[PDB]
């Protein structure tokens, strides 16, 4: 079985997974709308009661599984719990990241395409007034995506957008086909520093931004000024717990698959805690210092609320490109920005596609080459739904990363720490550990963590159990995908009985 070569590379691959566009866009937006600096209170609390506990558990299940030649949850859940239902629930953790891959790789391709357009200077050049500056870029994006101009829910992405998507897919395949160490790990050792340099450079450049409307200091001010009165809102406490899931990448079955390449007695306690810390530093230090401050510096702290409510996607693909076009050498600033984003996604997308690569290897005994190609073929195919069907993307993201990760996360807890046995599990976590997990965490993992997750489930339920008919197409497809994965798992166990 493949293994990580260096302890360092392991951490950089894991942190590479967790560090994403959410660090630079999603996290800052959430913080600004939920108490600013006061949002750190329920965020840190969720990091300690939910994030860290769940993270160690996924590392634990991963390594425990990897030692027995299985990297995915259909096999692993069966090992912790020998039921038929256990294999079935495990499919979710093979299904979730595949659904995400169907739209993520595509969104990742946008950043690549934008980065190219910005580098060669093929971008709009306005003109005055905010709507007169934003609109040329709002249109720049819509022509790339192919946002419907009529009542039809049909996207018509440009030939360039589609071609970059191909190139992007090809780039993912290139790394993945070289394997865990020589491919993913080797790239993590290059990408993560390159990422850090780009972030710092942009951070410095943003702090020097001075416009008649404001400064970057005003941005860091508006963002970090604590509004404790919002801490009374449960919704803030829910947003924090949800954000932790998103920022760390819990409930996707990726950490599990990665940790299955960790050797049987190698440390997962300190290593995981480290990669988790790298991610959080990248969020609060780098991500919170670029997007929002620049937006406030140019549009004033007066629009700082409106900017935050405009959504993370607008901030990163319309607002920030528009601000750059109005700065000295801003067209190159746009390129660094998108190239920063592109790598941040590319380190995450190779990580998410590894789960399917692992399954085909471990359970269907495919060569790494075949597993990678058939995985790419599936992800490439499904993406056409995201590319051509309007709001298809939103529907996949709702199911896969709304119900999916929070439900499947709780399923990970119960199976490992309740069914498999809390005591056996606690040993499985701490075994070979450079440092040991604090004794108090045994209670958190057993009660507090699943309590929070259950509340997030019911709170999601009541609010979200309550769209155009075309969603049924996306629902039809993702349901079908689950069925198809169920079939492969079925074929996997029929092959094993023969041998
Ligand atoms: C949150 N992280 C770490 C990135 C993940 C993700 C999941 C959902 C989403 O909306 C964006 C990214 C992702 O890496 C999961 C595997 C498939 C690619 C995306
Ligand atoms: Na993150
Ligand atoms: Na990444």
């Amino acid at each position: 079985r493949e293994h990580w070569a260096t302890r360092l590379g392991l951490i950089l691959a894991m942190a590479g997974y967790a560090v994403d566009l959410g660090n630079f866009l999603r996290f800052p937006v959430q913080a600004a709308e939920n108490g600013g600096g006061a949002f750190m209170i329920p965020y840190i609390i969720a990091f300690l009661l939910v994030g860290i506990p769940l993270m160690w558990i996924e590392w634990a299940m991963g390594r425990y599984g990897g030692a027995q030649g299985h990297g995915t949850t259909p096999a692993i859940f069966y090992l912790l719990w020998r039921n038929r239902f256990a294999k079935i629930l495990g499919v979710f953790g093979l299904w979730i990241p595949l659904v995400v891959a169907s739209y993520y790789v595509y969104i990742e391709s946008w950043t690549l395409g934008f980065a190219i357009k910005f580098l060669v200077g093929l971008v709009p050049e306005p003109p005055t007034d905010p709507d007169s500056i934003l609109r040329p870029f709002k249109e720049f994006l819509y022509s790339y995506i192919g946002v419907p101009k009529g009542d039809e829910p049909i996207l018509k992405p440009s030939l360039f957008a589609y071609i970059v998507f191909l190139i992007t897919m090809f780039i993912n395949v290139s790394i993945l086909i070289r394997g865990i160490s020589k491919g993913i790990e080797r790239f993590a050792k290059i990408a993560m520093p390159t990422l850090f340099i780009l972030a710092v450079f942009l951070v410095i450049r943003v702090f020097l931004l001075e416009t008649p409307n404001g400064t970057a200091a005003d941005g860091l001010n508006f963002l970090w000024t604590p509004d404790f009165e919002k801490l009374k809102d449960p919704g803030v406490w829910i947003a924090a717990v949800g954000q932790i899931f998103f920022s760390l990448g819990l409930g996707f079955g990726v950490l599990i698959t990665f940790a299955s390449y960790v050797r049987k007695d190698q440390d997962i306690v300190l290593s995981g805690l480290t990669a988790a810390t790298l991610n959080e530093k990248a969020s609060v230090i780098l991500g919170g210092s670029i997007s929002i401050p620049a937006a406030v510096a140019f549009f004033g702290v007066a629009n700082a609320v409106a900017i935050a409510k405009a959504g993370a996607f607008n901030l990163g693909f319309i607002t920030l490109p528009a601000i750059f076009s109005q700065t000295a050498g801003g067209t190159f600033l746009g390129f660094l920005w998108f190239f920063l984003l592109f790598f941040a996604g590319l380190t995450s997308s190779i990580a998410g596609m590894q789960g399917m690569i692992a399954f085909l290897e471990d359970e269907l005994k495919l060569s790494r080459k075949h597993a990678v190609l058939w995985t790419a073929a599936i992800v490439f195919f499904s993406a056409h739904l995201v590319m051509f069907l309007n709001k298809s993307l939103d529907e996949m993201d709702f199911w896969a990363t709304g119900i999916g990760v929070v439900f499947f996360g709780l399923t990970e807890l119960i199976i490992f720490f309740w069914i498999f046995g809390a005591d056996k599990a606690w040993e499985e976590i701490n075994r070979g550990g450079i440092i040991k997990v604090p004794r108090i965490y045994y209670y958190v993992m057993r009660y507090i963590t699943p309590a929070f997750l259950a509340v997030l489930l019911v709170v999601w339920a009541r609010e979200y159990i309550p769209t155009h008919w075309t969603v049924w197409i996306t629902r039809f497809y993702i349901i079908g995908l689950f069925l198809f994965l169920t079939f492969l798992v079925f074929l996997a166990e029929r092959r094993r009985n023969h041998e």
Side-chain angles (χ1 to χ4, degrees), residues 20-215:
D20 59 346
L21 284 82
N23 280 71
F24 305 99
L25 299 171
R26 193 178 200 278
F27 167 81
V29 169
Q30 294 294 335
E33 292 187 1
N34 303 271
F39 181 72
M40 286 306 105
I41 292 303
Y43 181 76
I44 295 170
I45 284 182
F47 179 79
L48 294 179
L49 291 179
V50 182
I52 292 299
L54 245 181
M55 168 212 58
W56 277 326
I57 291 177
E58 293 196 17
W59 278 66
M61 289 182 290
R63 181 180 63 178
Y64 173 78
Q68 306 174 63
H70 301 302
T72 61
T73 55
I76 293 185
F77 283 10
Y78 192 58
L79 300 187
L80 307 172
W81 177 28
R82 287 210 146 210
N83 203 273
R84 174 148 301 275
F85 192 54
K87 285 186 179 177
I88 298 180
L89 292 186
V91 175
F92 278 92
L94 189 61
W95 174 81
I96 290 174
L98 207 53
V99 170
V100 183
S102 298
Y103 66 93
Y104 195 78
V105 174
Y106 187 51
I107 293 179
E108 166 183 307
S109 67
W110 300 354
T111 64
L112 182 59
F114 268 67
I116 298 172
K117 299 288 282 297
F118 269 82
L119 181 55
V120 298
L122 289 167
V123 292
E125 294 168 19
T128 317
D129 289 337
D131 206 42
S132 180
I133 303 180
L134 294 178
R135 189 169 59 254
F137 284 88
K138 188 177 213 175
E139 290 171 355
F140 182 78
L141 178 57
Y142 290 4
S143 297
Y144 192 86
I145 305 314
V147 177
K149 294 161 259 54
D151 293 32
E152 313 276 58
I154 294 303
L155 299 154
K156 189 48 187 179
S158 50
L159 181 55
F160 178 75
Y162 187 79
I163 282 169
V164 173
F165 175 75
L166 278 174
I167 298 172
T168 306
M169 273 293 313
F170 172 82
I171 293 171
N172 281 80
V173 166
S174 291
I175 309 179
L176 288 174
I177 208 167
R178 276 160 178 74
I180 293 300
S181 65
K182 300 174 178 298
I184 300 181
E185 187 181 21
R186 177 175 178 262
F187 185 82
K189 284 181 169 186
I190 296 180
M192 295 304 280
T194 307
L195 214 59
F196 175 71
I197 294 175
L198 282 173
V200 169
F201 188 87
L202 294 175
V203 162
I204 295 170
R205 177 67 183 88
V206 169
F207 290 172
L208 291 174
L209 279 183
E210 289 184 318
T211 78
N213 289 320
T215 56

Side-chain angles (χ1 to χ4, degrees), residues 366-408:
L366 263 56
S367 66
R368 190 173 58 219
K369 175 175 70 175
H370 290 151
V372 163
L373 295 184
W374 281 110
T375 293
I378 289 174
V379 179
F380 175 68
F381 187 81
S382 345
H384 287 67
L385 213 56
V386 165
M387 290 192 293
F388 292 95
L389 194 59
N390 188 26
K391 295 309 177 184
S392 170
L393 188 164
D394 297 74
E395 184 69 12
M396 298 195 180
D397 177 89
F398 173 83
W399 288 111
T401 84
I403 82 115
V405 306
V406 178
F407 160 82
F408 188 77

Side-chain angles (χ1 to χ4, degrees), residues 418-434:
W418 281 97
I419 296 179
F420 177 78
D423 277 20
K424 300 164 59 65
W426 180 263
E427 298 300 317
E428 188 54 42
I429 301 178
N430 299 274
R431 178 169 54 84
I434 293 176

Side-chain angles (χ1 to χ4, degrees), residues 17-18 20 97 100-101 103-104 246-249 252 254 348-349 352 397 401:
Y17 165 69
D20 59 346
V100 183
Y103 66 93
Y104 195 78
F246 259 114
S247 194
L248 297 188
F252 290 91
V254 173
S348 290
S349 65
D397 177 89
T401 84

